Subunit: 341 residues, 3 copies
Amino acid sequence: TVTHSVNLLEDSHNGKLCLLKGIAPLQLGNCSVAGWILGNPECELLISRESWSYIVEKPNPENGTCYPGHFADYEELREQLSSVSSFERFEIFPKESSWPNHTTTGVSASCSHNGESSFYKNLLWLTGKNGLYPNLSKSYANNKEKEVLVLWGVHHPPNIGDQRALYHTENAYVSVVSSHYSRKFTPEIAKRPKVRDQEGRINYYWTLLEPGDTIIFEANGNLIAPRYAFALSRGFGSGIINSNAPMDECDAKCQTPQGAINSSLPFQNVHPVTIGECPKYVRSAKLRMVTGLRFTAVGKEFNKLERRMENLNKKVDDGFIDIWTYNAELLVLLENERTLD
Amino acid sequence: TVTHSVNLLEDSHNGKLCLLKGIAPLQLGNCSVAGWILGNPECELLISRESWSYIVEKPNPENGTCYPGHFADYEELREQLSSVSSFERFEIFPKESSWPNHTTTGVSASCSHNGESSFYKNLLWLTGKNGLYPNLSKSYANNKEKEVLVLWGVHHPPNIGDQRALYHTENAYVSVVSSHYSRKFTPEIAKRPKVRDQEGRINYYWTLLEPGDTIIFEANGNLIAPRYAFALSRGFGSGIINSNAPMDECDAKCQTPQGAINSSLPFQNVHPVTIGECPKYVRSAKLRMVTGLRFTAVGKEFNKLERRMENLNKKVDDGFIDIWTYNAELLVLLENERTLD
Amino acid sequence: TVTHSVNLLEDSHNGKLCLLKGIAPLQLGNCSVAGWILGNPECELLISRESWSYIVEKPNPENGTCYPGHFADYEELREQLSSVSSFERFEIFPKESSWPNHTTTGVSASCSHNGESSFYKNLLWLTGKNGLYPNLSKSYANNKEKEVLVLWGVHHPPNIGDQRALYHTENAYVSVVSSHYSRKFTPEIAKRPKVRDQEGRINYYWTLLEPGDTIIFEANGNLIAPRYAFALSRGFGSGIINSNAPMDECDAKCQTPQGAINSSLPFQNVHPVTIGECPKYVRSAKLRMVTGLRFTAVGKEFNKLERRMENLNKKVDDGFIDIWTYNAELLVLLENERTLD
Ligand SMILES: *[C@@H]1O[C@H](CO)[C@@H](O[C@@H]2O[C@H](CO)[C@@H](O)[C@H](O)[C@H]2NC(C)=O)[C@H](O)[C@H]1NC(C)=O
Ligand SMILES: *[C@@H]1O[C@H](CO)[C@@H](O[C@@H]2O[C@H](CO)[C@@H](O)[C@H](O)[C@H]2NC(C)=O)[C@H](O)[C@H]1NC(C)=O
Ligand SMILES: *[C@@H]1O[C@H](CO)[C@@H](O[C@@H]2O[C@H](CO)[C@@H](O)[C@H](O)[C@H]2NC(C)=O)[C@H](O)[C@H]1NC(C)=O
Ligand SMILES: *[C@@H]1O[C@H](CO)[C@@H](O)[C@H](O)[C@H]1NC(C)=O
Ligand SMILES: *[C@@H]1O[C@H](CO)[C@@H](O)[C@H](O)[C@H]1NC(C)=O
Ligand SMILES: *[C@@H]1O[C@H](CO)[C@@H](O)[C@H](O)[C@H]1NC(C)=O
Ligand SMILES: *[C@@H]1O[C@H](CO)[C@@H](O)[C@H](O)[C@H]1NC(C)=O
Ligand SMILES: *[C@@H]1O[C@H](CO)[C@@H](O)[C@H](O)[C@H]1NC(C)=O
Ligand SMILES: *[C@@H]1O[C@H](CO)[C@@H](O)[C@H](O)[C@H]1NC(C)=O
């Protein structure tokens, strides 16, 4: 365009999910956030990962909720976990001593691992023993000085005989309480479409038990209790990135779902979603300054019933993306009009 | 302002709801979206309209929900239907063969047509027969390769005798299930203010059964079952316009609630809501460029309990409307300062 | 920077919560909005205040909900009350004649006043009498020509014996109905963490009964009925300000949580939240124009389960704050580049 000029825009991503500042992300792989937290057997991240720089999820992961059901506030949980830099996966309710008189080792084929029927690892499918499902009243007091992510579930069996078998009551209930949180779940029994060869459901629920707060579970049946929980360490700059790009042990300053960015420029256009010390996104292509003469992630953050939000958010993000872009162009269009003197 | 100048702003709307690209809108008239979908008798659009370019609703339509009650996620449904370019109204559950042993032809005065008591046309008010309301288990499998909008309802009668009469049970339930969607409704019996001379209620519910998914209804009473559903064809550019302006068989490129726009200009100010190839809205009035010398609809998108959203959305839309406007003015204010050379 | 210049930015707040246009705010003090509306005894604003220019709340007020429980749509109520310029606190259900055969004067230590156990003042804790809790069916018809804010509550006692004592039924219910509003509450009985030395809960509910609409309460127990309600007078410019700054009987044109603003300038940076005829916020510090040569409140508007909203709103507000700021700077940066001629 002119003899001397400087480009400000970076359009080249290394096409890989590098390290960030020398810390490594968490690759869920086939697994989704729901399976990871719940401990879907196919994930194997449980024992091995507790820290990262960012989380990596694939566009359409299939290994999430193995036993069909509704994961309440799934997207709110995603937004919670975006800011989690690390955590501690601890056995809030030890399987061995917490449930002496309840048949742990409830298992389903819908969650099979290596061919054998199994179940989530961070949860527990309680069932009666010796013909009893005695009322349970287990409690946990968050004394870890970090907010504790607790998971649990309620089994909505397909028929009354199944419930009578698992729990030996027709009219069971699940009560979960804390200092603020109070809720009661009754199982809904009904035949349903046979997802993953299973005709029942499990409703998955969660809450962030704050330090000092005490959470109580009461139940005469239908509880998928927690075996492990998570003590969360919040962190800025981290976040969740949806992508299927490969990784090497490259290190970078910025990261984006298509690839990392390792360049001094202020701007870029590969993708607005970004993590770390990164250039700022624009839609443009031609940011040249003459020197001579002649944010949050997106995509799965909202569910069916929230399409307003998405639209609104689509209206907002996209708006700003345009807005600043224009200004940026204008700024150079001004500056070139000036620095041509 | 100067000898030579070009105006960029269009402030003249033809005051009519023309055709768009030669396709005709859907004029609900007195009827609202709720009555249209539910099939409020006063609408008469059912047999006759299945396609359009945009939907037209009046500010305060009175012919919507004839039998009083809460239409769940009404606004979410509006946002769903904004993107519907057309659909197919089909008899998911034929009245004649789907309910052989249940008294169809339940009717109320609150939905009267031509003086005779009647009922919604896209719904069915089941009632017992021969002293029985046998449990029903009807199912539908979406094999139409398009997402299917299903409607239904639950009758909350004013008193226990009314329920015992209609359904011959005091403790009825309604279970609606799909691959994800699972829900259970119990009728709430109570005397209430006598809206449209009716002391009971009907809670209206809906869902988008995706292709291949199977929806099951179970009930021992209190079901207002569907007679017709809708297979949706999504479409960009379409949308919902709230207005009372008249129509002629004029054709236009753009449309707005006050009137259409047929002009080459890039900008305008008649209304931000617009459909089709349209000039872009601003608040301004004086966009002149010298050549010489000296989005989504709005208004009813949110309910009572969501006034944050509206405020937020009001904060956003109005913001951008201002923002760009300024820039536009600035752009000309700059350009005139330049093109005066 | 240059010999002649004018500053446009105001960075000095008087550090006090003055009057606005000569009208005085409402200082809740220790009390929060919830306690104020509910009538937490420690507030004493009830008899004495019904009008203001704005509301003042402290960052972490401790005197709100005295009897533990969930205040439904608390934040939506805050947003409702932001636009309330005044109201009329009237005894919708007179304690003396509305509940002849129900033991008013239910009291708890969790709401103690001056050492004596007491209870909210705008609510009523009904309890049985002479061994009966006869079904009640009290009603109110809004004939005040202003929307009426109604409050009520449901006692979820810690154990079945407590409920049997207060209400002499194990399976109570609370039905609240209006022309649109219909709802039913069943008490959930469970031992819980002993907040404010209380092991039960009260779920607080509200609604805006519009003029002409009739609200009906039905109950066989567990009702914390209303004693007073509020007829609301909407008003622009008013709002809610969260702060702990002191007050004098100073008068001002604008107000902000850190302090008032009394200055002619168009801009400022002390705080974006503002009330009244105020300069417009920016982040900047150096707005000088040469003449020579060389919105809504924020912070508590959303709850736990809504962190998307907050993020979104944080994304929006902060965005605009930046955006306009830039433009403003640009505008002067342009103008100085021009007015230096
Ligand atoms: C985990 O995902 C795998 C697939 O990624 C599931 O295994 C089977 O995958 C094939 C395709 O490779 C499907 O056709 C099968 O239907 C899958 N199995 C079943 C039983 O349907 C596996 O089921 C998933 N398991 C969990 C726990 O997520
Ligand atoms: C449809 O709306 C019409 C009015 O547009 C309703 O008919 C009556 O309208 C008059 C005013 O013209 C009202 O005073 C009456 O109260 C209305 N009827 C009743 C029974 O109140 C009609 O009821 C509506 N019907 C439906 C099914 O929407
Ligand atoms: C109102 O708030 C006061 C505190 O501002 C509460 O009174 C006690 O305050 C001290 C601290 O000054 C705490 O250590 C005590 O725990 C408080 N009392 C109790 C019983 O815990 C008072 O309880 C509050 N009351 C209401 C109705 O809000
Ligand atoms: C699922 O995970 C397994 C094990 O890592 C892998 O072999 C497979 O490729 C993954 N699924 C897909 C679609 O790649
Ligand atoms: C569990 O059951 C055994 C059965 O003998 C009993 O001895 C024991 O006390 C029970 N423990 C708990 C914690 O319920
Ligand atoms: C309602 O529809 C009827 C029939 O089209 C019409 O006569 C009437 O004018 C409509 N209502 C109003 C207020 O115009
Ligand atoms: C309906 O009832 C009739 C009564 O004789 C019975 O013959 C028939 O089998 C029933 N059909 C269904 C579908 O319930
Ligand atoms: C609570 O209110 C009382 C009475 O006005 C006051 O003495 C006390 O200082 C307030 N609390 C705090 C923390 O200031
Ligand atoms: C209240 O109870 C008394 C008991 O004698 C009875 O006389 C009176 O009719 C009752 N009133 C109401 C309103 O229930």
